[model samples]
Target chain A: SSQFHGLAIGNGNSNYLQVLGLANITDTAYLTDWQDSGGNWHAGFALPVPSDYPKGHFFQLTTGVGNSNYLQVLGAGEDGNPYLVSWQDGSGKWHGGMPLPKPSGYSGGPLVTGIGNSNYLQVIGARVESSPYLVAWQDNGGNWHAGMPLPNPSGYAGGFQQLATGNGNDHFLQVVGVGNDGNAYLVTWQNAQGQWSPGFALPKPSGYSGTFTQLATGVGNGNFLQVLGIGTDGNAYLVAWQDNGGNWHPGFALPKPSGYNGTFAKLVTGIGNSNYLQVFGIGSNGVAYLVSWQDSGGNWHGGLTLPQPSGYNGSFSQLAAGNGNSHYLQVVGTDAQGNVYLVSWQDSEGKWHAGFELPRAS
Target chain B: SSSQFHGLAIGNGNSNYLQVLGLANITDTAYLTDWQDSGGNWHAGFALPVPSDYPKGHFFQLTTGVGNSNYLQVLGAGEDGNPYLVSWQDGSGKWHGGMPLPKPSGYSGGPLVTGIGNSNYLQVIGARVESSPYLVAWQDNGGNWHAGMPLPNPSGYAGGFQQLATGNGNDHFLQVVGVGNDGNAYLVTWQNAQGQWSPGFALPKPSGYSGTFTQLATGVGNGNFLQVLGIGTDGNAYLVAWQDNGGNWHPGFALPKPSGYNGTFAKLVTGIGNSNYLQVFGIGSNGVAYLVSWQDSGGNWHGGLTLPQPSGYNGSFSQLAAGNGNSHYLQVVGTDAQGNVYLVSWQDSEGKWHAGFELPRA
Candidate 1:
């Protein structure tokens, strides 16, 4: 059921980049996806972005016809500036978002999103490190209102490594980060009736004082929230919802592949055919990867050995993706050297597409 | 003590001006602050100068410290985990060299503190740098800091605690909570100003509640009435408080869990609601923020009031922190999940809460 899609990315002045741009396809749909899916990406559109939009964090609302998936992007502008964008997708109609109110000593981190039951809430949010994470929403009348601040644990004034929002099941937001004390912690919020929840104590297992720096969340099994977190220390785990609306997760650690020294850095996820959840990742080692999957019954399948990306040096630091549809999963990762790369996986054919360097904005 | 960047707010006695405070991100050796005027408008972050000898460890305050009634005295621990209190100066917002106190006698781990009402004294508590977790200390009105006191062992008390004080001048009293070896919450009292603290004792729990309390909060200075709040294993928040009338304190009170929220409270705090009420703040299960308050006593409880809407914030009290507020007006402050300290103020002029806005990062 998948038709056409494009990858978006950005780098700083020291490398490739933009005010903010989408590396989309210039050719027809079938030709772009089935043939030249791995072509020059510098040929797309450059829109405005945040003041510190280096990595230029962006996300898609997953609704479409052609390149119609709305992009919620972060940019704090260059001056009085912390701004957000709600790109209108098709025809590159760039407009809609505005800047954050003044007196902000912070800028947006990566972007995550949400939608309320009615036209009342269309949220574009970001995890703010060293401060409370943030969100600005639009009302049914198209007016924007600043929401209340998300609460943090009292003694923790640490930033989040990443935030992921999953649709359905009342799940609104999931965040994973190392507390200022240097241990990993999670915050989950579920929206109900009309409002979202405040944070609670989801601390590390008693005495498990290690760091958690990488994570990805999505419905991989049973439509409940599933999270995959990787620690700098030799550790990794896949935790999923234990109680439907209760905010509890009883997950297990990932098995070490022997070659794994736990340097697992880049992490991302998506839901594939049969609604099965799958993880895609690359370590600092820059060599191997995992397409870890879970069955319909929610049992995890060990990572299958995979071929390395050809003609690419391989060091990557940032990762993000989505399963285009039940049969197609597309991924993107920023190169440690520079630029972003795309990898496509087709569940129907059980194949992987590697080293498709996305075109950079000149 | 709480995180360096965990937010705190102080009222200027104008009942209209609120100052939100935080630390410079990461190392937190510096200070960051924001101010809000009567119109609810906020000014950008401005640093409250400190002596170069500022402590880099975390900071804390209870009943919130008031300097010259318009200023604030800052308390922090040296990197060695010992205490250092920064005294507020006259005008021009200049901060003088803070007082470096008693040597570290294992007065480390997560620390807590409270202000001596109507006096120049400060009371500090901390868990020892040991498994048994030690707790106790005080910086007297005479500016003499007592050496850290060796506290309860695993057998005497083992988990959870609080720092709360009430009354005016030398008549002020103190109350703290500690978990006993039996796992039940116990109240350790020091019911007199210039008084010595006693051993742990029974806490009058919410009537009909059959479980151990995992969290607690108390408010003082409301015409001598005191309110104590709790979050139990039963997934709910309860309270037992009343006037200091010639008689005794009462019990049997709890906040109605939000109508659609299915989780219990994770963190609880109290703020002076206005000229005469006590407002309670809590992080609902799943990281949601809510409130409960009172007008008269245990019988006239006002609850289930959620934090400001749409853009709601989630927060928790990390080990080393407690919330801050004033008796004349409600001003709540804490770290948001992203760890940036921010503030949310409430002034019930018409018996309605003013929208909760964030105190930006410095």
Candidate 2:
């Protein structure tokens, strides 16, 4: 099971989680890859956790290269120095590469990755302070360039608290962060020919003037952005979207979710069964459910719900979704026990599966 | 400076001792260490520990210095690519370390990595992320891993320092030679024996020579004079000796070219001279390592000897390293065309060099 201080999904052909426990089979930590065996989370392969893993540090994943088919899990090394010590899957069996040189001046908050230049992995993160944003790139070859700092957007004097990147596509990396101003900002790795843009601001929902407290981005059939923002008003909003060409079309006043408390705490999005955007929201009451979705014809729907796992009664502390996985509307969350459980709405037959334990190596 | 290449030779105060640190032949992160006992016997190179999760880079740079004990500090190239000093502390011959410097904001990702002073207290001087020259990390007394910050820019060379080299005057002030965008080697130790470094004027170049330096190395020679061995843009080498750390470096000296040596030196490096005789070694176009020995606290850099290809070794050196053992004998380490690392020593009085031939693989 994904019994760990935190969990991560290294998606490609197979998925994985760096866990602290394999359902109590052993206390040793592991970088375990898993399989959704016929709709069941089947823990498959693993590598013992590398040293200096920075106790409970959040593990990151992205589009990997070679047979790994996933991004390298870069993090603090045995010395709390940042490193990419996670294993690379070669032909289905996990193996280590020649030591992957890690980054330096490593400021630890969290690491987010995206496919950069189409063939490389771009990892961005915050430093101890200042711009809070530094980026490192893995080349078409197995080596990496040094860390480069990103210019901060205006009004983001305090840097950002929440950091995220675009779904693994978007040839040029797209970044989104919740700036201290309580407004969201966007920065992109311009392209293979240039460096990053100074970054821009993501506007508020329509006429609502409150600061945002939560933000997440997804993309449907169009390779652009679909943002969900929950502002100071405590109401969730489908705040923005990007045109096919990457222009931010903000000021959205989409119809709101119903049958739920007006109070919300989390917002996340994934592609729905049909290729439209599906937004999920967790209420302040601890109930997790799909609050909105776009149908193939562009109609919006609600009344979506999730079935809790039979044995776990506690609420989730965090949630995430998507991948190169079949369950486009996949939803994953971790409980306070540090154990992660997963659920997904199968597009094959339009069925929402009950939550299952996250996977780990057997 | 050394680890970034193949191997390094560092000296110890006790018994004029020396140790060679290198990478495990098949494992870059797993290092190999060799120690020279008081009897002058070169012990076989043995494997030392590397940071768990540490990756092998196409290149690596290490700073050797003495702290509470003999220590070898490594660059912190984490997931973000900033620089941190991770290490393998050598106490009682057992090398161990896990402490990594906390990230200091000004350090961005791509500055040149350089270390000078005793392998201990070697100051890692270069530009921080802002292109502002920084004191970066110079292990305090080779022990306290202090944070580094911006120093006043080298007198008007706005590009910060392109290269930094310092003399062997370890117990006193650091006699630093900072090469700037101006092409001239700026004398910036104006460091009052206490590291209160200020921008000193550029030392005069040799007559008819351009100040632009392609490579620079330092040594403590004759009058305990601070010496610099620089390869000029025209591919010729020149010498700059400062009479007193605080006195003068107004005029630079010259190292006349040897016949058959058409300059495009593969590498040029200086050996610690222990304040009496400074030595510079260069691999000429023929791959033969030539030594230019200087004394007089200032002049007469004599053409030393040619490190010839030994019988059956069948390779020319591509890289090199040299250090003073305090025994009037200097040791050298170099990697040959076939990538085999070798060590040899020159006994000044005996005018003979021997025994770095059959060293254990490092």
Candidate 3:
């Protein structure tokens, strides 16, 4: 049943790069994949599924940390929530994708990140009493861990919770919540040895009237833990570990943007040349605002409204930051449509890239 | 024995305004006392009368005009949990018989009031279910009353949360916003000149959205357009507008959610005050309140200030009302840990937030 397909065959020795952007290549059609400058042959195989399978739906691709060989994808089922579709790269060839799991509950807010050599997916929701709950899963070895509660026994009250993890001195995962007491609480899980430690609460700030709203965490130059949150005073509060040497510095309030009159709802921090924090908040006028801080210095940038994409009619609810290619910080967010988007900034170039939607399977 | 307190002196002097801050003494009864720089001696004060109707959750407000007699309006729920409004003119200084609001069909959500033109032009809005439909009634002018009306929507509204915004243009205009059974954001508007409401319309939900929204907020910006905001099912924010001057509708757009924010929104509110600008307030799933604002000129938006919620406030918001005369201000009513109502306000231009004030026993 194999059939040969024609290609604008490059000089066999010069085709070093591969370009496979086909949407519907037919089953059993074999086409020339790629060739190197030294005239080497690369075996390529084609196996297509029956045409009845759902096709042309948009799919979001997330690259994992294992040697850049794992590509986990999220696509909408015929029912509208999301399902996992994945692919793996073996040396220079592609491998099989096993049947994966669908997202539990709603699909709008699941976040994916690579830690060490595995992928970690986390989502915040209420399992009971409508209090905030953090449910997470991790891909370890070749198996997936199901949704598990992150050691928050009392459950969060009041507003939504936030999750952030970083590979600092220790692989650290942090969950920040507005506790029932109305103050912000932090729960941290770290890998001290090879095993993960039980989660524990960080010390509360003095006179904190339960107002730590949204939180973001990252590792700085020395892999020191740095955390940021919005305070009831409407200012950004920074609490960081100086050298990961144990003591957490007193909470320091960041300077407010002029005429700022709203609270931060989402926060992200990362190292881009230096440590930086980004915030998503609404202005008193209901406009989405973006603000950022470079580091421990009081210098702050941004007071600009986020761009309203042509077809997006909702706000960004979550943000994740990491390096794209160079030292550039690439940030990702999900629109109200459950569509993931990417935007990046390069500290070396001192410029920001326009936001773009991640292509899906459709 | 009544203990004398310093700074309780009051005198009829050249000062035309008497701002009395009420205080509860050891007896647990509150009395309003004021200090007049013109007088050095203190004077005894009388306790305000408690209404015989619904005694708990009693709230009071005072309105003044340049020449018209100042009036105090007292609001509370009756035995049926339906709200009643009673007013007292300075001429009599005693509350008149309460004017009861139409007993809401469900009596579930508390009531919110907005004043337009002057003190006499007050409108009240409420809801009946978690997927709440808005119900409204208004006092238009001297001795003029607008009968209660179920704010119209096509699905009759599956009900979630509702918000009302009013503004003065060629005519007095009112707009109502809420989530529908389909989870989409819906809007209905009325202008006194027409005396009839426009049909309910569903704003375009973001693509792939299941159309669910948790909270709604609306306000008139510079009397130019009625702006609306809703928390999408994904826990992100969406906004759209209807122009007042041209009677044109604007497409909905996404608001950027705070980074790392996984919490859903619980309450939203908006107001247009003396600045000819619009301000929005929201309480997140974490129970922290946020404030943002925008203006009519050049469509400039400003400030994402976090306001300190009341201490130990662990419950969702119940009602939010905005008004502008001397300055733009927003008052929010929410339940405490014990479920008792507390009221607080943000002074817009002054950039100050007032908290910890609770409803009276009356």
Candidate 4:
């Protein structure tokens, strides 16, 4: 039953590549696991325990490897809340598949990111009351904590909304939200100590009447948290940022393709090279675009659309990034046809290379 | 015994018509009262409750009701900085109990007070600590008191002096102006009807401004609007700005400094004439006061007359309060050679200034 698709990889180290995906074509509930040993991808059913598969298929990896480079998988458990499954190198056994501790009524989809070197899995989601809540777990120690409610000064309309987070200075995490004002609001939390701090609302540029829909974050050159948001104007705006010192700076627009009128649906940022920033997003046209910037000298490149694989004519649904090593970073996204793809870029040629297609589940 | 009108009042009725000007000058804390009989004028200044004279000697009336059926509420700060209030019926001459209203902790400096619609008085003050602690007290019907939480500043606030102003027509709104820690001016407004308060926003300041303001004043002109004026750090260039009914801000431009003389300016004074015209006045160098007028009908700004200092008046202009008395009037309170408070009025209908009269201590 190796008809696999919907691939998500968590590369905790150059030698440890852990991927999860739907494992059956007929039964929509089974997800299979695999790993890359050297350059070859192997199936999970070949393991010592052939039937060792997680339940309730939809699975995603934390944005980056955390805590001693352990690959943590977040997936739906028997209950509605997410379960955390962890795998550590040198120990061929998977350690935990336990229900994560969450706030009451955690109904919205969860967003998980690795917070710097502290090896913390920062989780955020919306509640049944329609407000955003945040929770965290230390994968290294398996310490679970309750989620904290965010400040909603301008009572927003009830809805589980889009959210994104990234590591800032001193291992702190910055959380960004699209406010009811149709603008953006930011709040921050300390990594290990878990102290939350108040944040200011970012002002919209003069005459910019469009609303922001999605947001992403990256670590820039100077320990600054760079924030990117896709606006209803169908263009991506790189709004201001927070420095390591917990200060905010003004923001500006990012370069886009000429006459690119399609709206962006998702945005995620990751490190390609040391201090080299890369932003990836999917457009309404069902094409993936990549924009890279060098953190050392805040320079950004124009949007480059990724090449589509033959027989894959579907829109992308979700995106994640993983670090294979100091020199290698890769992005993973699922297409509408339940197929997953991994994309990487070449430095010398400055071009995107569509790497490998994930096997269909079952 | 003929009662005299020392000032003016406007009705809160359909046409908003009223009367002014009388003469019983034996004033020991006299209220400068008046009476209305169906658009006709009557007076018995001797029969009304005299307010306890406040320091700096300023007075104004809050009008409620429409047409011939109106109520006149007179208020002033007691020596203790607690505001005192008393109301009188238009046709019946019925008087309400004169009592002290609740004041905030920082009311020692004669906290700013003004009337919203329906005889409600709004009082605001900076905390006695002067570190930007602000509080509000709302007077409900029956002259009871309700206190609000300290005002919130989105950006951290720098403590200093503050001014309060209000407007009516489409809604009853109150706005407070103060300086932020960055030295930029910030304004926050509360809508009484909606029970909503807007976040504090920074106002545009000229380059090199010291972030300190000496005086602030707001008044309603034609079209049921609100306008504000302030003396900047230079103390010479009075800045003028206005807000539309929809709550959009029209930032201010600097008024030309008074020609050829070098004396620091005092606080600004603002008033609205019957024709919806607006005028602003400030004490130029050497205690000499100058006026600037704006014609709302014609949309023109004019360099106004330099008001001659009243005879025997030697002290500089100290306080100012303006309102539409008989036909748009202004009051300027200054100190005489003997340090006594001298009050004078400028009548728009007469097209000339009146002589100064001494407010004798009780």
Candidate 5:
């Protein structure tokens, strides 16, 4: 079998490939761990690969290759205890490890996911320690760092959280989630040497539950952070975390434009430049959409909606950007035929160009 | 199986991968007319990995899983008179057309290559029918487009013979290969929006090779060409070109060092950015196998050496590559005992070389 990243089954129609993960099969649920060959293994989720099941088959990224010696990332029993795993191809074969000193608190599987794999991605998640503490591990050499505990606020252990890597030179990592108040709270940490500095809390949205199930983080060269997620209002919102040296410019809100609700933003965020950030997801009527904005320091230019995949695939989608900000913005998802499909958007004349169709595994 | 791009095999170990390509069971002289797929399909020669008798199962290109596969856009001469682009994917995969695309002038077969543009574009160039050179490229972002036009030249010596054996970016600049009737090798390139080719200049010849045969050149990025070893009139192997970044190619160097007699030269170059490494493989002086290559940054050429091969009695050899990360993957194709084709490769981890497996033939 080829190295599997992560696979997600859809409503009998589509599937998604997440975290460059590998998989193993079992009886009840096809177990998968972060077994990536590309970089470090991130996270794993199993969905149905429709064509496979007598009724339904599961797609998963597991800790091991086969039926033997599989490592459970974190027991599903510990709901709020979050555990992180990753893989590296050093010394020939693939190796996986969870950071030492799992956070004193924890969060289990509900919102677990594999962050994009690369040398710079350090695994960060909400742990159910005394409270939901933001815990992370940086992979230095082959060793995982002892968990670097994020400074948790007095009343902010809301577990369905999100974290995004920073893009600008000031270099900060953004962590956003529903606060203990059930309102959205945004915090950021600038990278100093190897450790993260004190977190700066962005103002909570007015009358918002902030129960952000899906939030996307992208880095702009000189900008703080462009954060996108479904807000408590059941609408998509964009906030810019502009770091002003020691101070942070307050976060502003960009409500879902015109007539669309940016729901279930199951997408990736990317900083195309010092001024642009794009958040893509399934918008109105389960149709895929993208909204890009030019961050003019204090204002976000309006974002627009785009067509779903070029094909007729009623499914969730996933995208990743690689080869610099130039070449790849690949979106892999399943089709109506229960087969996976990949559609890519490339920068052309200031817009994106789509390919006919790329190669994919069933 | 991953996608098969242009493949080259040099014999390795006692097992050879190219042997299956032999005309007869024991005679290493004839190229096989067809390859047998597991589905019992009799596909023509070009689609198979190595040949029947070559025991080394190694083949190049990127393989997906065990089954999904595709051939790279390629041009080569088969046992058949007509030149065709032999396309294939494992069973269940669709077949690509093997149209006999026209070649640049005098180049009968090809001296062609495909590269990624800084823009994720795939570019292909080769010797043309009329003795000139034709360049074709696809946005990889959009579609393959014709690069400006063909580089004009005469037959026999298209001057367009050279290409950036290794590319720093798809859009930056590419080094082109050119061979002169006077036995001289030259390098030429064009950058950005430039139209015609940059000045075609001669490669610094290692002081020894009196004549050049089967010119093979690979770049070690802008660091100047890392290693350019070839067969000289002396029938010995020599590094005919080594100067990079406008440096002159010096001869009489100790790499691939000594020109062994009666061997052809081929090269594989890859690395980070302009910093690339070189792998040279061909026949040596003793009428057996010979290989010598160098690295960039450190080691330079003085440290490059002819690797001690596990196989003997190898005639023509071909090697192909698929990675440019810290480690590189290579496959050597050559004829071995019993006249069978054998393919072998080395996996570089640190400085030690580990022997890989012989691929099972299709």
Candidate 6:
């Protein structure tokens, strides 16, 4: 007699997180149960925390050191100046988030790309170079200042990098294979302000066997910040950090794009309205497919469905995550060349609502 | 039988200029036209304009000023800030004062005297200085003021001063005579901002030696401004204004009260409702004191009594008051012709009036 896998994971909730800076230990097989063995073979890896920090990513301040604070984040108003707003104090409750005021006298306005916290909360962004901005507010007289900009990134635009803050300090490590050239290289710095160390090469994407790498969403439960970007292989991958650990967690894949009919994939994981991961893309049938994942209590799982992209014909799209606690999650995309529609989602009602009809900017 | 000899003349109509000084000399003896006369029967004298000198009333602001020819000067709120008796010379060389006599305070419970200026209007008698036994300036616009000094009357004596009326000759002058504040009615001149009281001299009271509140309280040049009679405390209609004596005021007299009051006396308003549009509502011995109002109707007083008294509401106690400005509207709140306690006002473009509406219940 045989038992089906669907019979096991059915009627269960989903769980999600990200994986980055992956490393493999041994390419061997392992088993989950000894008795009455099933054909569910297990693969293993020893993802050690990267001791030697990468160039573009830095861990200036670590949470568990001076304060048991966790969760470093970055965000902004979509229209204008972007500043870092982060959450700390995960003592079984959520405190008011520390909203960083806009920096003084930056013409083009700063955009917060990633956030890390070591001693003081540190914010990183590409729009501003090499040195990251460190922000802190005093108890009595409230004020905020830009400590410094992140060390200049070595690569040009259209590249991806990971920068982390821990112990209220930062060190930049250039991410390999992130630039447009696609040749894998990385850079790092110890404590230089507005400066960076030399670059180094990492394993190419093709070297990772059996897994796909592409742009995907990230998730965070406690202080853990994680992300997954699908690889060029059309499959998804991941990156994650533990409560207070300094590490480069690597990538992995989901079974397959089952519910989603879309051939093109877009992934975004956010906590707005609810702590859930949402991925959307256009289907081969020209309809948009949205696949979602969430962790209910313990189990991690997935579900996919088609989201109504109006009644439009073939359309490409962009999925933008709303800031946590915002009324709705904004999914912005252009239909046909010029028509853009913003669709928003609500969690309690478990439904999507058409949101702001933005006027065309002149 | 010969008709009572009453002759009239048009003073300053179509010539929109301010009169600086004026004096009226009575022609016939033993038969005076009364301090106030609409029937007109006297000639007015004039003096040349003073040299840019004495304090004068400005005329520009009133009538919204030049090129718009039909501007008029009428007595407004004395101190209460409502228009009572106003004088506007007709285009036909006649001087017309608001009919039904000006009152002390306006309807809404404020004073009549507005500050001095041809246009910064006020209710009539806002200029009445010395009369009756009281040295009280009962009404004032909104602010506080005092009887200005001749720069010497800090001691508060009642005589040794005079109100000089310089005029353009066409308008009338309102004067008074009395022995000090007591003794008896006498001849004196006034309407001075400096408020100088004339040295008192005596004169015989008109035939009725009874202390009637009705005396020539004020008057103007016979042709300057006329008076329309209404029922007085004497239960008869009385029209009063001042007469210029040399440079002082003479005692006031009565005019032929208009032809209709059904035989009972109606107490006219404490002052003219509006020199522009005057009204008198009283019950006659016929149990219907007419609700009659006048508006320079075709060059003379022409009014109709529309509200007939109900048998139950035959005792007339209807009162009227008018305000200034475009909203210079009139309100008649009392038992209507049907005996309903209705409040009505004239509202229309042609001044014909809309149907009287009822007010909200208290």
**Tens digits of per-residue lDDT for model 5, B13-67:** 1111111222221011122322323332223343333322221111111111111
Error of 5 at A104 (Å): 4.2
lDDT by residue (tens digit), candidate 5, A127-178: 2213333344434233344444565543455332334444433444445554
C-alpha displacement of B124 in model 2, angstroms? 3.3
Best by lDDT: 2
Q: Candidate 3: misplaced stretches above 4 Å?
A: A1-136, A153-160, A188-201, A204-210, A239-243, A258-265, A274-282, A285-292, A295-325, A329-362, B1-362
Error of 1 at A210 (Å): 33
The digit string of per-residue lDDT tens for model 1 on A1-362 reads 01112233322212222123222111011111211223223333344443333222122211111112344344322121334543443333445445544324333323444555453443333444445444555555545566555555445556453454545465444444444444444543545554544454343432344556555665755677765665545356664343466456656666544455534544567555576776766543333356477777878775643343444443333345544433355555433222345544445555555655554333
TM-score (chain B only), all candidates: 0.73, 0.81, 0.58, 0.65, 0.57, 0.38
Docking class of 4: incorrect
What is every candidate's C-alpha DockQ against the true complex, given to 2 decimals? 0.01, 0.01, 0.02, 0.01, 0.01, 0.00
DockQ of 2: 0.01
Name the docking class for model 3: incorrect
Clash numbers, per candidate? 41, 27, 45, 18, 100, 126
Single out the weakest 10-residue window by summed lDDT for candidate 4 chain B.
B19-28
lDDT of 2 by residue, A276-340 (tens): 77777655444566767776555566645567654454455445665434544457765433345
Q: Model 2 segments beyond 4 Å from truth?
A: A1-362, B1-16, B23-27, B51-59, B69-80, B88-91, B110-122, B127-130, B168-171, B259-262, B272-275, B296-298, B326-328
- lDDT for residue A21 in candidate 1, whole number 0-100: 28
What is the C-alpha lDDT profile of model 4 across B1-362, one tens digit per residue? 21222223223221332322121111112243432234322232333454333221222222222211334544433322244453343444444445454544533323334435333444433311134434545555554556634555534454433344444423556665553333345664344554455555655553344455534566665565566566665554445456677866666666544455444454466666536567776654343555644445554556555555555443333233444433334444432211223454445454566655544321
Q: Relative to the true structure, how large is the alpha-carbon lDDT of every model?
A: 0.45, 0.53, 0.40, 0.48, 0.36, 0.29
Q: CAPRI band of model 6?
A: incorrect
Residue by residue across B216-293, what tens digits does model 1's lDDT show? 556653456555666665657777444354424466566755566665554566665544565666654333456644
Question: Considering summed lDDT, which 10 consecutive residues are worst modelled in model 1 chain A?
Answer: A25-34
Q: Considering only chain B, what TM-score does candidate 5 achieve?
A: 0.57
Question: lDDT tens digits, residues B1-362, model 2?
Answer: 11112334353433445666553211123244555666656665554444443322211234454444545544433333445444555545555544444445555443234444443455665422225566666666636667766656555566555456655443455666666645577665535445566665577676667657745677666656666777665556677544454565645666755544554452577775434466777765433566754454455566556664443443345456776553556777665432345664445544465545635543
Best by TM-score: 2
